[PDB]
Design an enzyme around this catalytic site. Sequence first.
Site, PDB file in Angstrom:
ATOM      1  N   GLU A  84       0.817  -1.206   0.000  1.00 45.39           N
ATOM      2  CA  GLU A  84       0.000   0.000   0.000  1.00 45.39           C
ATOM      3  C   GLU A  84       0.855   1.262   0.000  1.00 45.39           C
ATOM      4  O   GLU A  84       1.933   1.300   0.610  1.00 45.39           O
ATOM      5  CB  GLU A  84      -0.932  -0.007   1.221  1.00 45.39           C
ATOM      6  CG  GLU A  84      -1.859  -1.222   1.257  1.00 45.39           C
ATOM      7  CD  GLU A  84      -2.494  -1.444   2.616  1.00 45.39           C
ATOM      8  OE1 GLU A  84      -1.799  -1.280   3.641  1.00 45.39           O
ATOM      9  OE2 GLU A  84      -3.687  -1.798   2.659  1.00 45.39           O
ATOM     10  N   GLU A 117     -11.296  -4.033  -1.742  1.00 44.05           N
ATOM     11  CA  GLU A 117     -10.963  -5.312  -1.113  1.00 44.05           C
ATOM     12  C   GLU A 117     -11.521  -5.296   0.305  1.00 44.05           C
ATOM     13  O   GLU A 117     -11.878  -4.240   0.831  1.00 44.05           O
ATOM     14  CB  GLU A 117      -9.443  -5.509  -0.975  1.00 44.05           C
ATOM     15  CG  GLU A 117      -8.587  -5.133  -2.164  1.00 44.05           C
ATOM     16  CD  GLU A 117      -7.109  -5.441  -1.922  1.00 44.05           C
ATOM     17  OE1 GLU A 117      -6.642  -5.318  -0.767  1.00 44.05           O
ATOM     18  OE2 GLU A 117      -6.413  -5.794  -2.891  1.00 44.05           O
TER      19      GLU A 117
HETATM   20  O1  LIG Z   1      -1.923  -2.096   5.991  1.00 40.86           O
HETATM   21  C1  LIG Z   1      -2.561  -3.291   6.420  1.00 40.86           C
HETATM   22  C2  LIG Z   1      -4.033  -3.044   6.681  1.00 40.86           C
HETATM   23  O2  LIG Z   1      -4.119  -2.140   7.799  1.00 40.86           O
HETATM   24  C3  LIG Z   1      -5.448  -1.850   8.229  1.00 40.86           C
HETATM   25  O3  LIG Z   1      -6.101  -2.975   8.756  1.00 40.86           O
HETATM   26  C4  LIG Z   1      -6.444  -2.879  10.158  1.00 40.86           C
HETATM   27  C5  LIG Z   1      -7.823  -3.485  10.375  1.00 40.86           C
HETATM   28  O4  LIG Z   1      -8.784  -2.732   9.651  1.00 40.86           O
HETATM   29  C6  LIG Z   1      -8.172  -3.484  11.863  1.00 40.86           C
HETATM   30  O5  LIG Z   1      -9.421  -4.133  12.060  1.00 40.86           O
HETATM   31  C7  LIG Z   1      -7.071  -4.205  12.657  1.00 40.86           C
HETATM   32  O6  LIG Z   1      -6.990  -5.527  12.263  1.00 40.86           O
HETATM   33  O7  LIG Z   1      -5.796  -3.595  12.412  1.00 40.86           O
HETATM   34  C8  LIG Z   1      -5.408  -3.626  11.016  1.00 40.86           C
HETATM   35  C9  LIG Z   1      -4.039  -2.978  10.936  1.00 40.86           C
HETATM   36  O8  LIG Z   1      -3.035  -3.834  11.464  1.00 40.86           O
HETATM   37  C10 LIG Z   1      -6.278  -1.233   7.089  1.00 40.86           C
HETATM   38  O9  LIG Z   1      -7.646  -1.156   7.492  1.00 40.86           O
HETATM   39  C11 LIG Z   1      -6.170  -2.064   5.794  1.00 40.86           C
HETATM   40  O10 LIG Z   1      -6.706  -1.317   4.710  1.00 40.86           O
HETATM   41  C12 LIG Z   1      -4.716  -2.426   5.468  1.00 40.86           C
HETATM   42  O11 LIG Z   1      -4.685  -3.355   4.391  1.00 40.86           O
HETATM   43  O1  LIG Z   2      -1.892 -10.414  -1.151  1.00 44.41           O
HETATM   44  C1  LIG Z   2      -2.086  -8.994  -1.110  1.00 44.41           C
HETATM   45  C2  LIG Z   2      -1.487  -8.343   0.138  1.00 44.41           C
HETATM   46  O2  LIG Z   2      -2.202  -8.868   1.290  1.00 44.41           O
HETATM   47  C3  LIG Z   2      -1.792  -8.332   2.567  1.00 44.41           C
HETATM   48  O3  LIG Z   2      -2.059  -6.954   2.717  1.00 44.41           O
HETATM   49  C4  LIG Z   2      -3.433  -6.562   2.622  1.00 44.41           C
HETATM   50  C5  LIG Z   2      -4.085  -6.595   4.003  1.00 44.41           C
HETATM   51  O4  LIG Z   2      -3.912  -7.891   4.572  1.00 44.41           O
HETATM   52  C6  LIG Z   2      -5.574  -6.277   3.821  1.00 44.41           C
HETATM   53  O5  LIG Z   2      -5.929  -5.199   4.660  1.00 44.41           O
HETATM   54  C7  LIG Z   2      -5.797  -5.821   2.366  1.00 44.41           C
HETATM   55  O6  LIG Z   2      -7.100  -5.349   2.263  1.00 44.41           O
HETATM   56  O7  LIG Z   2      -4.913  -4.735   2.111  1.00 44.41           O
HETATM   57  C8  LIG Z   2      -3.555  -5.157   2.021  1.00 44.41           C
HETATM   58  C9  LIG Z   2      -3.169  -5.101   0.560  1.00 44.41           C
HETATM   59  O8  LIG Z   2      -4.147  -5.634  -0.313  1.00 44.41           O
HETATM   60  C10 LIG Z   2      -0.299  -8.595   2.787  1.00 44.41           C
HETATM   61  O9  LIG Z   2       0.097  -8.037   4.036  1.00 44.41           O
HETATM   62  C11 LIG Z   2       0.484  -7.945   1.642  1.00 44.41           C
HETATM   63  O10 LIG Z   2       1.891  -8.149   1.812  1.00 44.41           O
HETATM   64  C12 LIG Z   2       0.032  -8.555   0.304  1.00 44.41           C
HETATM   65  O11 LIG Z   2       0.726  -7.901  -0.759  1.00 44.41           O
END
Ligand SMILES: OC[C@H]1O[C@H](O[C@H]2[C@H](O)[C@@H](O)[C@@H](O)O[C@@H]2CO)[C@H](O)[C@@H](O)[C@@H]1O
Ligand SMILES: OC[C@H]1O[C@H](O[C@H]2[C@H](O)[C@@H](O)[C@@H](O)O[C@@H]2CO)[C@H](O)[C@@H](O)[C@@H]1O
Length: 516
Positions: free
Chosen positions: A172, A367
Amino acid sequence: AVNGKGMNPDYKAYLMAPLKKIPEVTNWETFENDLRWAKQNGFYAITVDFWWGDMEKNGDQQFDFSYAQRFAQSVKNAGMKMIPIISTHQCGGNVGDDCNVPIPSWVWNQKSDDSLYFKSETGTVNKETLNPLASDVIRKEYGELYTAFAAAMKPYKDVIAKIYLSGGPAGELRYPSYTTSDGTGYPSRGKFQAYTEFAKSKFRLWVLNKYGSLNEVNKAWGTKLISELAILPPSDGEQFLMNGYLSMYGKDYLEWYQGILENHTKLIGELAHNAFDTTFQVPIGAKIAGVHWQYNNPTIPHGAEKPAGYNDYSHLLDAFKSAKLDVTFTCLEMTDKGSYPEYSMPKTLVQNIATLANEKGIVLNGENALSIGNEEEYKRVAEMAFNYNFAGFTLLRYQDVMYNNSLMGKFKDLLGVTPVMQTIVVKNVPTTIGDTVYITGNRAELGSWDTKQYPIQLYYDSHSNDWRGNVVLPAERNIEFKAFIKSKDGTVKSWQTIQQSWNPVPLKTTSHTSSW
Ligand SMILES: OC[C@H]1O[C@H](O[C@H]2[C@H](O)[C@@H](O)[C@@H](O)O[C@@H]2CO)[C@H](O)[C@@H](O)[C@@H]1O
Ligand SMILES: OC[C@H]1O[C@H](O[C@H]2[C@H](O)[C@@H](O)[C@@H](O)O[C@@H]2CO)[C@H](O)[C@@H](O)[C@@H]1O
Ligand SMILES: OC[C@H]1O[C@H](O[C@H]2[C@H](O)[C@@H](O)[C@@H](O)O[C@@H]2CO)[C@H](O)[C@@H](O)[C@@H]1O
Ligand SMILES: OC[C@H]1O[C@H](O[C@H]2[C@H](O)[C@@H](O)[C@@H](O)O[C@@H]2CO)[C@H](O)[C@@H](O)[C@@H]1O
Ligand SMILES: [Ca+2]
């Protein structure tokens, strides 16, 4: 959908592959059968991380695309499409990560200073990805990686539907402001990540470039800095987030801070287009994180977003439009809470981003942030995706639906839909001067019976005296709907007598005619 429109006719559903290599999870035969199964349930393609740590592990220019090629071969065999993510970030350490793939260890030796990594307010060093400040190294390394990848994957151009670039941690475009080691994990406030000597010197030079001299700086900020060395990032992140951000200094600091990510977006976008446009001719995208916590915290408003690099989303998205990159928002399955201590407002966040994206004409994809184990979450995703013009939805992750038939069936019904244009015609409508006819129905693609923001507008046919319109509907799904009249002031005057239905909507374009 919003603005009287319907769902995006280009909508497609995607599936995230495992973080580990397929051979570490199952065998290629089973994988191919899984892909055929996914396709039967509405999935158009599978997205997959190809780790920099795997492709250029041994040393500079020592590439190995054998896994990517083998993966593409199986996708081809299964008659599916794939979306590679050129993951120049570390796998492991982030939410949901079940892997351990750091970026090439040798990359860190290309510099003697601290220009390559991040350092937080309190000194925590982060090396999950290259600091976008080191544009010279990024230009060389990503440029070489992208071009080598393009040459090695040319034989599979026909199975590649899109290409994702990694703009930072977890793929990201953001700063690593929320990590366990830094003590900024969810739902805490984030810490700014610009305390390396290189970062301090860059901000200082940027400030001096803008104003010219220290005297002009002091005059603009209304400060009394004794020397150029006094120009520094916030000494106290919390105080900055409490009220320092409202000052002229705060605005400049945040402009520069977010500016680094915007310039990075343009750089990688240029490298990617130069490397893939002629060979693949497919859309290229990048991702923005959904930092929904501390959104409405009174003491530190947007206390998680700002340190992540998100201060002005409008300005951020302009960078994407400029670099010709489609945007993906990674958190759609949640609802607002906005209460202590998380102050989480995920849905409001999604709505704002989607609104801005549509206004700027940027293709928007989404997503789910965390694994979905309940049908209710699919409904939330559906509401957002089909009412805010999303061109695609990617489900995280593989195993969740592949090993759960009931969940897979619910996804097929609610999100694995193929949009098809249909003509809706309603006759004998008692409209008067100023009235407008709309339709709303049970499914999310029809606004879920909402008459305020999501109804679909129809158009009067002065020749046949009826109301009609070409609406995008989910093929082979059962729907129920009713037309209604909306006066010029916005109030709902009356509804169609009998509730209509199409069981199911045909796959071929035709028309549904009914009477008021
Ligand atoms: O950059 C990773 C991920 O971070 C955030 O996800 C949060 C999640 O929404 C919370 O419920 C909790 O699990 O902490 C996570 C961060 O460690 C972002 O919301 C998400 O877009 C992003 O992929
Ligand atoms: O396989 C895609 C991506 O998945 C993870 O990061 C996610 C995160 O887990 C979710 O919050 C998602 O909605 O946003 C992030 C990017 O799509 C892995 O941590 C990341 O390394 C991997 O590229
Ligand atoms: O670079 C000037 C000055 O910036 C910081 O102080 C800021 C503070 O971070 C803001 O919250 C607000 O109080 O304005 C201050 C400047 O007027 C650094 O903390 C400081 O060391 C530095 O000299
Ligand atoms: O609340 C959702 C509800 O919407 C529609 O009900 C309409 C009805 O058609 C009108 O005749 C009038 O009674 O207003 C209602 C809205 O409260 C759907 O017909 C119904 O199935 C659905 O549950
Ligand atoms: Ca290289």
